[PDB]
């Protein structure tokens, strides 16, 4: 069953197509379907927003700063927002943020909001009427959640194949499937940005990142938990989210931190006046996988001149006319005089 | 007040009719609004403050046939 939902007066004239999927199918067919059969441009960025759906407690200052920065990044870049297909949680707040920030602008202001979810929850939880594309995937009965995680891993891996396209992860206020998507996207070489000081699981990732840093191994010098504060993070991962079966997610959240260049933790109370797009750009320049022209035009779209002077225009990387040409056209047409 | 509004509080749930009339009741005294409200309550012989007196002060203090919404809406009676 594939087609196009017309939501019954839920805000917006444009309709959103949906596609039933199984996990047996590869992601390359999905990418050539969404770039040719559905007519989407190959973007400068893919943001993947991840958090809670049912259990979701959020601060008003934090929700306003998060939606303002995420809207600013996704509208100045023109990025794909990959979330779940749920009408409650962080997906609902991202959808309401898109709703209040896609109405009454210029006519060429539409953010391709893709939702990867399961067919076993739709009519679990109904679809959010603010998404623009739906990938509903299943293999068994209702209640299965991990096939969403596997498709969200492999489809964004194939986005990185067509690297070509930088894909970033944003994690705030989530549960066990949130950190499961975190692990499966660190497996697919997608860098992640964790909003520390936000909720129940992103605070655990932050408190495992900056409080328990340690390099005591050979084999590319991975990061693990401290033996001093392993009891505190054990009590925090067993008390704050998840009651039973916390051992697999504790070993999994220790294995998330295996690469220092792939996880980034940007708090709220540490830096308020620093926007989330600079955190995304620092994660993409920290992962060291994107092209220099992709880092360059992401710095152009976000007016990040100091990070461009620091880590994009270094000595060892040489620029020419043809690599700087489209960037120069963008900087002229958008009035970027420092660039 | 700003910190309360941007941590845990909404005006929609906080403010009621009695809180608003009390908020106009304990105005300090060095203002213009306490002589204006006491002059209007002297013109109506009512010892307590309600939103109709505040509305008439706002109507005579905007001019040009302004009609304040405390006089017309049932939420402020």
């Amino acid at each position: 069953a594939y087609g196009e939902i017309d939501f019954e007066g839920y805000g917006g004239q444009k309709r959103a197509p949906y596609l039933r999927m199984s996990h047996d199918t590869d992601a390359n067919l999905v990418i050539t379907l969404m770039l040719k059969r559905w007519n989407l441009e190959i973007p400068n960025l893919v943001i993947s927003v991840t958090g809670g759906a049912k259990s979701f407690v959020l601060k008003p200052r934090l929700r306003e700063m998060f939606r303002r920065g995420l809207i600013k990044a996704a509208k100045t870049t023109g990025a794909w927002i990959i979330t779940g297909g749920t009408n409650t949680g962080v997906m609902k707040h991202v959808g309401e943020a898109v709703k209040e920030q896609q109405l009454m602008f210029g006519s060429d202001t539409q953010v391709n909001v893709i939702g990867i979810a399961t067919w076993g929850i739709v009519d679990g939880a109904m679809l959010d009427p603010n998404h623009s594309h739906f990938f509903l995937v299943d293999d068994g009965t209702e209640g299965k959640y991990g096939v969403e995680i596997g498709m969200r891993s492999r489809i964004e891996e194939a986005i990185m194949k067509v690297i070509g396209v930088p894909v970033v992860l944003l994690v705030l206020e989530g549960g066990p499937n949130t950190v499961a998507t975190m692990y499966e996207l660190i497996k697919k070489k997608v860098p992640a940005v964790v909003i520390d000081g936000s909720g129940r699981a992103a605070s655990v990732v932050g408190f495992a990142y900056n409080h328990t840093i340690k390099r005591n191994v050979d084999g590319q010098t991975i990061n693990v938990i401290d033996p001093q504060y392993e009891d505190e993070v054990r009590a925090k991962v067993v008390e704050v989210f998840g009651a039973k079966g916390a051992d697999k997610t504790y070993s999994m959240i220790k294995d998330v931190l295996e690469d220092e260049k792939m996880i980034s933790v940007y708090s709220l109370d540490g830096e308020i006046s620093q926007d989330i797009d600079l955190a995304i750009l620092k994660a993409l320049l920290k992962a060291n996988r994107s092209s220099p022209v992709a880092q360059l035009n992401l710095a152009l779209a976000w007016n990040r001149i100091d990070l461009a002077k620091s880590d994009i225009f270094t000595e060892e990387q040489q620029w020419t006319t043809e690599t700087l040409s489209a960037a120069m056209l963008t900087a002229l047409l958008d009035d970027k005089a420092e660039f | 007040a700003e910190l309360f509004l941007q941590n845990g509080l909404s005006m929609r749930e906080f403010l009621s009719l009695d809180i608003l009339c009390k908020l106009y009741a304990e105005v300090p005294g060095n203002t213009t609004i306490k002589p204006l409200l006491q002059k209007e309550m002297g013109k109506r012989q009512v010892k307590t403050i309600d939103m109709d007196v505040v509305g008439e002060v706002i109507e005579e203090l905007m001019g040009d046939m302004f009609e304040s919404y405390y006089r017309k809406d049932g939420h402020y009676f």
């Binding site: 303002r68 209040e100 920030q101 109405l103 009454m104 | -």
Partner: protein, 60 residues
Amino acid sequence: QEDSDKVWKFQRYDLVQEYHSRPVFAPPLVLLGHILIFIKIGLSPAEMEQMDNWEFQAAE
């Protein structure tokens, strides 16, 4: 004279309001226009909320 430009801009409103309500009729025949009279926009509510959202974010 230090605010002459702005006070001309302010009285231009009064001129526009003086001539916006006049009869839509011939200049020697405006009394005939008063005979033919004798014989500020509102918006949709979702459109008003969209107005309010755009105005509030420009205020932001």
